[PDB]
Amino acid sequence: MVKVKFKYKGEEKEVDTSKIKKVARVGKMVSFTYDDNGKTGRGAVSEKDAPKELLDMLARAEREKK
């Protein structure tokens, strides 16, 4: 039951992992881009506050990059 619970426009918003385009990483937060259709959906959530689901999508990027 663990999924991305990022904060959109100052409010909790949930999005299926199936609608995930790119999961980038800036400083101490996670700036990913999900497919909301209407536009380039962008979500931001603290890495320590990142749900297992989204936290696993980062481990495959901070091992051969960072």
Cβ proximity of 4 and 53 under 8 Å: yes
Q: How far, in Å, CA of 20 to CA of 30, rounded? A: 13
Please give the C-alpha separations between residue 11 and each of 6, 8, 45, in angstroms, as whole numbers.
8, 5, 11
H/E stretch holding 46 reads strand 40-46
Query: Measuring CA to CA, how many Å separate 25 from each of 1, 16, 58, 64?
Result: 24, 19, 8, 13
Contact 4, 54 (CB under 8 A): yes
CA torsion, points 2, 35, 7, 26, in degrees to nearest 10? 100
Method: NMR
Alpha helices in 1-66 (DSSP H): 52-59
Instruction: Please state which CATH number belongs to domain 1-66.
Output: 2.40.50.40
Report the phi/psi class of residue 50: left, alpha or beta, with left for phi > 0 and alpha for psi in -120 to 50. beta
- Which amino acid would we find at residue 39? K
Can you count the helices (H) and strands (E) in the chain?
1, 3
Task: Round to the nearest angstrom and report the end-to-end CA distance of the chain.
Answer: 29
